[PDB]
Amino acid sequence: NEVFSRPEWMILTCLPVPPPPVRPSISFNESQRGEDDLTFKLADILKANISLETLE
Amino acid sequence: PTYYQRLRHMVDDKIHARARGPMQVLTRQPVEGRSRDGGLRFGEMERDCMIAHGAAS
Amino acid sequence: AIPKDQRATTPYMTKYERARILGTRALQISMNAPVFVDLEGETDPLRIAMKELAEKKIPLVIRRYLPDGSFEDWSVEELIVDL
DNA sequence: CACTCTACCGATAAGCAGAATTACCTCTCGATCCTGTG
RNA sequence: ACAGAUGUCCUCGAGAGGUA
């Protein structure tokens, strides 16, 4: 589609991050806090991007 | 006379009823299990049976 | 578009139509809304709705949609209730 | 008139991917180290 | 000049044993 879906948009150049409601944090046990797998994967992606930027 | 055994399944351990109980976090849907005051599940079979009945509302 | 009065649907009321009008009228009477019949000692909104429908005193209009998109309006009083 | 590969489709044969009834009850565990430090 | 506490539900992925 000319406006709705162009072929050049198929390459990911900007990655949106889901809001906290999409990936909430569980209660875990008492005095313990954990994060969803989405948060850890997003942090890994951000670390990889930062490493690539610094290396370039 | 006839020998009879009492099984482990009793009605007192299976009766459940919910009306606006605890909420979930992710999907904001009723929780699972009787011990957690959960709600009954409306499956796809119930949905299509109600479709066949014609009760859209 | 509306098919004038050269309508070609059925001159009777379907079961789904009967249920929908009965439910809408029951809800309207359950809320504070005027009643156009003699309650005569009835206090359940659904029974009041059936009493209103007995002599076709319900001011409701049925809009039957054709699959193409056209629709023809049928009055409740002009719909035969045989079921 | 068949001499040699050039362009065409019609079979055959191995590699991927999905997906497997519905509802309910109970218990039981696991959500991290060590080489490198002052 | 002023100002010391409370808001109710937390698991989650799995595994096993069973009921129609």
Swiss-Prot record, chain A:
PTM summary: The tandem 7 residues repeats in the C-terminal domain (CTD) can be highly phosphorylated. The phosphorylation activates Pol II. Phosphorylation occurs mainly at residues 'Ser-2' and 'Ser-5' of the heptapeptide repeat. The phosphorylated form of Pol II appears to carry, on average, one phosphate per repeat. The phosphorylation state is believed to result from the balanced action of site-specific CTD kinases and phosphatases, and a 'CTD code' that specifies the position of Pol II within the transcription cycle has been proposed.
Location(s) in or outside the cell: Nucleus
Superkingdom of this protein's organism: Eukaryota
Region (Lid loop): 24-36
Residues passing through the membrane, by range: none
Family, per entry: Belongs to the RNA polymerase beta' chain family.
Domain notes from UniProt: The C-terminal domain (CTD) serves as a platform for assembly of factors that regulate transcription initiation, elongation, termination and mRNA processing.
Stated role: DNA-dependent RNA polymerase catalyzes the transcription of DNA into RNA using the four ribonucleoside triphosphates as substrates. Largest and catalytic component of RNA polymerase II which synthesizes mRNA precursors and many functional non-coding RNAs. Forms the polymerase active center together with the second largest subunit. Pol II is the central component of the basal RNA polymerase II transcription machinery. During a transcription cycle, Pol II, general transcription factors and the Mediator complex assemble as the preinitiation complex (PIC) at the promoter.
Name under which the protein is recorded: DNA-directed RNA polymerase II subunit RPB1
Span of the entire protein shown here: 225 to 280 of 1733
Swiss-Prot record, chain B:
Subcellular location(s) per record: Nucleus
More info: The binding of ribonucleoside triphosphate to the RNA polymerase II transcribing complex probably involves a two-step mechanism. The initial binding seems to occur at the entry (E) site and involves a magnesium ion coordinated by three conserved aspartate residues of the two largest RNA Pol II subunits. Present with 18700 molecules/cell in log phase SD medium.
Protein family per UniProt: Belongs to the RNA polymerase beta chain family.
Quaternary assembly: Component of the RNA polymerase II (Pol II) complex consisting of 12 subunits.
Protein function: DNA-dependent RNA polymerase catalyzes the transcription of DNA into RNA using the four ribonucleoside triphosphates as substrates. Second largest component of RNA polymerases II which synthesizes mRNA precursors and many functional non-coding RNAs. Proposed to contribute to the polymerase catalytic activity and forms the polymerase active center together with the largest subunit. Pol II is the central component of the basal RNA polymerase II transcription machinery.
Name of the protein this chain belongs to: DNA-directed RNA polymerase II subunit RPB2
Swiss-Prot record, chain C:
GO biological process, one term: ribosome biogenesis
Recorded GO MF terms: DNA binding; DNA-directed RNA polymerase activity
Principal place of residence: cytoplasm
Keyword Nucleus: yes
Compartments it resides in: Cytoplasm; Nucleus
A GO CC term attached to the entry: RNA polymerase I complex
Region Leucine-zipper, annotated ranges: 39-60
Keyword field: Cytoplasm, DNA-directed RNA polymerase, Nucleus, Phosphoprotein, Ribosome biogenesis, Transcription
Free-text function comment from the UniProt entry: DNA-dependent RNA polymerases catalyze the transcription of DNA into RNA using the four ribonucleoside triphosphates as substrates. Common component of RNA polymerases I, II and III which synthesize ribosomal RNA precursors, mRNA precursors and many functional non-coding RNAs, and small RNAs, such as 5S rRNA and tRNAs, respectively. Pol II is the central component of the basal RNA polymerase II transcription machinery. RNA polymerases are composed of mobile elements that move relative to each other.
Other information: Present with 6090 molecules/cell in log phase SD medium.
Family: Belongs to the archaeal Rpo6/eukaryotic RPB6 RNA polymerase subunit family.
Record text on subunit structure and interactions: Component of the RNA polymerase I (Pol I), RNA polymerase II (Pol II) and RNA polymerase III (Pol III) complexes. Component of the RNA polymerase I (Pol I) complex consisting of 14 subunits: RPA135, RPA190, RPC40, RPA14, RPB5, RPO26, RPA43, RPB8, RPA12, RPB10, RPC19, RPC10, RPA49 and RPA34. The complex is composed of a horseshoe-shaped core containing ten subunits (RPA135, RPA190, RPB5, RPO26, RPB8, RPB10, RPC10, RPA12, RPC19 and RPC40) where RPA135 and RPA190 form the DNA-binding cleft.
Protein name: DNA-directed RNA polymerases I, II, and III subunit RPABC2
Name of the gene this protein is made from: RPO26
Residue span relative to the full protein: 73 to 155 of 155
